[PDB]
């Protein structure tokens, strides 16, 4: 219970925070688009090619069967030619994101896949743009879908950065790694658990709770 | 209004030639309340669909207002739609949207002012009723008061031309007679092109000038609703004209039934009347002029498309002399009369 | 004395207020007879229905089938109890994973039945139902009618003493429900199975019910053979049923134009009702003659409802004050309820 | 690649093989039991607890919660205590199948879900026994629910015992840990990539051909 050792498992918080977040964020800027691409561009949908879906969903298929740890290591030649840096967080959300992009579009895509197909159909009806179907039809449809993808990503971005720990990102999963992995101390170990446990529910408790009210 | 012509459609599912439609011309007077009767799967779907050009025809060619439809480019075609206003079987709507911004959607999609998207579709949703419920969300709303944000969505735009895809398919007869009542005073009013497919006969009758029956591909007929309902060309819209008529004939009779005449019989017969025939009382009529005896079965009056119309199902008691007199009798006044066997 | 119903309520919970499903219901159920129960949709038809398999639990009453009493047993007596008292569903509640064969032998499997007499039972209900053809299929590949026969046939699997009928052919078409409800009676008129059956569509009680029960609210209205149901029917809300297995509709420019206060230049509207002795006799023929009046027949028709003829008249009657008054005498005379639904 | 290398990664990929079968086979012999004892106590059901519900719930949701890789370091001990070692293949066997259990039981108990409740109903009916009904019924009619759980389940677990190769569980996940990431090789570390994504390929289809052969 060393104050200094809190003072830092506080900072190893902050590490985890914003490796969970930045990375999500960044998760969705390349999955959002790699989402709707895929279900627009699904057969019987309006784009209807299987040429560019079949590509587009086969690269989403071949990264997310990658395994985060073994992904995050392989990557680390790439990652630290575009950061410079393979280690630090800063570095390690570039694993991250590519960790959860993938895993996001084919949720975007389901999430899209749920809403009414004559949605579009009333839509094309009215002279509705498909940048105006997706825009002001599908995606405001497909929100409880959306906000609901999003707490998973991050409850899942929370277990994927503390692996990075073993590659050394460095964070509050990392202070588990020294100290539970090399030099056991119960209370310091009991005590990075018990806050991701926690860290979880919050994210859980936030996400589920804006759903409630984005539902109508 | 709408005159379609010729146009054929065939799909291409599955290595399968599925003649959707077949051969279909179309012609709509403006301002006039037109429907389209088949079975399932015999084009309706795939033709109303034809008209905004939902679905590209193969063949044939579709002008609304005069202006030819498919020879167009995609944002030449979007403004054309703005005058083609649709309304779905499933309601369709926004689960998102409230009732007010659901119908200030097809308004959004072509930019315009707030206050004139405000002062547009306040008009409509105080027309249908539903100026009231502004503030509720589709999960709350009614069968039939979905159907009346989809109505005012699909005139948000002023068009010339209502379509409706079976818009009552699923919906409760009190809320059927309602809606379809509702579209009848919209005709009226503003000289809206209604044009609408359903499988339904009850709604037929109960808001179209003119009918189509359709099958197969092919449309088969076209004459007034109440034409139709008298004197059907083909075995098809018989069909369709007897489930209308509820005309339940007894089970016990066939066993019973003779189809040539036996002695101690009593011919029974199938009496059918048009117009102001059916609210004359002429089986009591008969009853004393011929003195013979009709056991009444059957009876069942319904108008069908402004015309009223009756059919029934009697046997005849009395001697033969005087049969073939209230026979020749009825006839005379214009009741179908048709001998089936014998009791 | 087959099933004895009697008192049975029913109460729930369900939320910040108690809601009553049954009112002291009491119905006997003769043994080899159909007794069905009519009722709009909410009444308690499901919950009546399931007392008496006690898949629902009576707040208070007693529940005698096959003489025994049902509602305190063991657990384990109870199993006991079910092998006497098969069941069928609007939804057909069938296995999607399991054959035809092995959805009827399901019920036997639950019994340490050995295989040798299972498939002997099995082949027989299937020869029964008709689809002894469909040995080998999948709920997924049936259509409802073939669908709903394998669920009877399951039921009959443990050769049960009282069939009961959750709305079992609600989701079957006409055409297709009259055959299932015809078997359904054979298999009561060839092996003398009791059967109880709830219903939201009176077309269905009069083809197969030999008695009736008429439920509206969780208690019971009308409660009497289907043949005095279908004829001298006591209440106004059992009238509207019958009327409905009938198709008699007024139509609509009569109901507006029809006003229940006399005025100048009226005739009455009024409806009949034939019991069986009148249905046949050509009386509005003969009224016509002998009190000089001539009646507009709107709409009319007959059928039969628990071996017994019966049918309805939508007729208005045109003539003097006094002659409509004296053919009316002579329709109550000669057993036609009269009854004036107001004037035109 | 080294001909010691070449004998190296059939070991690898053998322990890796091994500890996910193993572990999703003992994730199973637990969570399967949860899972159906979750669903039967739910409100309405068979058995319904709203008290026992909550607890078997919530205790689900926390161990499901704890991200794998702290829940395994923090397992090390217990670890220790049964196995009597902390590192190896059978070592790994252990914090793998805790991990697998809570993840199960969700799953279990959701695909019993998609069984329509009144064959329940027409269970009792017949004269069924709450044990004949999950045995006769339940679990049949779940079985492509269950049958996909499984494979979805083995998956998570090729890559939880490949985080378990960073902590000394061996396996592909310790060769890509140590010569992908302590010392770098290129032959070395992608091998053990294409390893892994075949082995995941190889368990979907598995999978999927399984669960195409449930008749409709
Ligand atoms: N998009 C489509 N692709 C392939 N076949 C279709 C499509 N739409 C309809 N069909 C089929 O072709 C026929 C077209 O008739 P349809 O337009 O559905 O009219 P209806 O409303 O009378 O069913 C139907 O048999 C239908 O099953
Ligand atoms: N499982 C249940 N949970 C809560 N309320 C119920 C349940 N079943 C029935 N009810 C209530 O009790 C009334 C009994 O009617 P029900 O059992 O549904 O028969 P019916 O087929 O006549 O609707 C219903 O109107 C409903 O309000
Ligand atoms: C719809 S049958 C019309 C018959 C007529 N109302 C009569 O009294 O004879
Ligand atoms: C149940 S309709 C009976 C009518 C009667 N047979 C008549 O024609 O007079």
Not at chain 2, 23 to 40: E, K, R, T
Not at chain 2, 203 to 229: M, P, W, Y
Request: hydrophobic share 45%; net charge neutral; glycine share 8%.
């Amino acid at each position: 219970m060393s104050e200094p050792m809190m003072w830092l498992l506080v900072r190893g918080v902050w590490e985890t925070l914003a490796m969970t977040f930045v990375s999500g964020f960044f998760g969705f800027v390349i999955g959002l688009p790699v989402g709707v691409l895929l279900y627009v561009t699904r057969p019987g949908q309006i784009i209807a090619n299987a040429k560019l879906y079949r590509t587009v969903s086969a690269i989403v298929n071949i990264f997310r069967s990658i395994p985060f740890i073994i992904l995050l290591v392989w990557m680390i030649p790439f990652t630290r030619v575009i950061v410079g840096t393979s280690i630090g967080l800063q570095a390690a959300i570039v694993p991250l994101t590519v960790g959860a992009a993938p895993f996001i579009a084919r949720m975007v895509e389901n999430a899209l896949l749920e809403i009414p197909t004559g949605l579009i159909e009333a839509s094309r009806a009215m002279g509705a743009t498909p940048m105006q179907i997706v825009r002001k039809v599908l995606l405001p449809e497909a929100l409880p879908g959306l906000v609901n993808a999003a707490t998973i990503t991050l409850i899942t971005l929370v277990g994927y950065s503390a692996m990075g720990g073993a590659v050394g990102a460095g964070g509050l999963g990392q202070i588990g790694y020294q100290y539970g992995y090399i030099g056991y101390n119960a209370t310091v170990m009991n005590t990075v658990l018990v806050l991701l446990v926690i860290l979880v529910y919050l994210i859980q408790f936030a996400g589920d709770r804006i759903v409630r009210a984005v539902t109508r | 209004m709408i005159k379609l012509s010729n146009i054929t459609k065939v799909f291409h599912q599955g290595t399968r030639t599925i003649q959707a439609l077949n051969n279909v011309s179309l012609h709509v007077p403006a301002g006039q309340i037109y429907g389209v009767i088949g079975a399932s799967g015999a084009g309706k779907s795939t033709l109303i669909r034809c008209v905004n050009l939902l679905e590209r025809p193969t063949e044939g060619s579709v002008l609304v207002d005069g202006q030819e439809l498919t020879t167009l480019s995609e944002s030449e075609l979007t403004k054309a739609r703005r005058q083609i206003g649709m309304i779905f079987q499933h309601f369709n709507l926004l689960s998102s949207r409230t009732v007010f911004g659901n119908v200030a959607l097809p308004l959004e999609l072509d930019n315009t002012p707030k206050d004139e998207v405000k002062r547009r579709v306040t008009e409509l949703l105080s027309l249908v009723g539903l100026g009231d419920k502004h503030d509720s969300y589709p999960s709350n709303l009614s069968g039939g008061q979905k159907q009346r944000v989809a109505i005012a969505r699909a005139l948000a735009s002023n068009p010339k031309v209502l379509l409706c895809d079976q818009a009552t398919s699923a919906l409760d007869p009190a809320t059927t007679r309602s809606i379809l009542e509702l579209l009848k005073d919209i005709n009226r009013r503003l000289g809206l092109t209604i044009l609408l497919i359903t499988h339904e006969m009850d709604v037929v009758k109960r808001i179209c000038d003119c009918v189509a029956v359709i099958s197969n591909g092919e449309l088969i007929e076209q004459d007034t609703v109440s034409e139709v309902f008298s004197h059907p060309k083909t075995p098809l819209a018989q069909k369709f004209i007897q489930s209308t008529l509820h005309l339940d004939i007894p089970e016990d009779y066939q066993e019973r039934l003779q189809a040539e005449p036996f002695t101690d019989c009593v011919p029974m017969l199938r009496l059918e009347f048009t117009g102001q025939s059916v609210d004359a009382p002429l089986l009591s009529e008969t009853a004393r002029r011929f003195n013979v005896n009709n056991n009444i079965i059957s009876a069942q009056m319904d108008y069908a498309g402004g015309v009223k119309f009756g059919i029934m199902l009697t046997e005849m008691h009395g001697t033969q002399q005087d049969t073939q007199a209230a026979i020749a009798w009825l006839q005379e006044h214009h009741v179908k009369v048709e001998v089936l066997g014998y009791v």
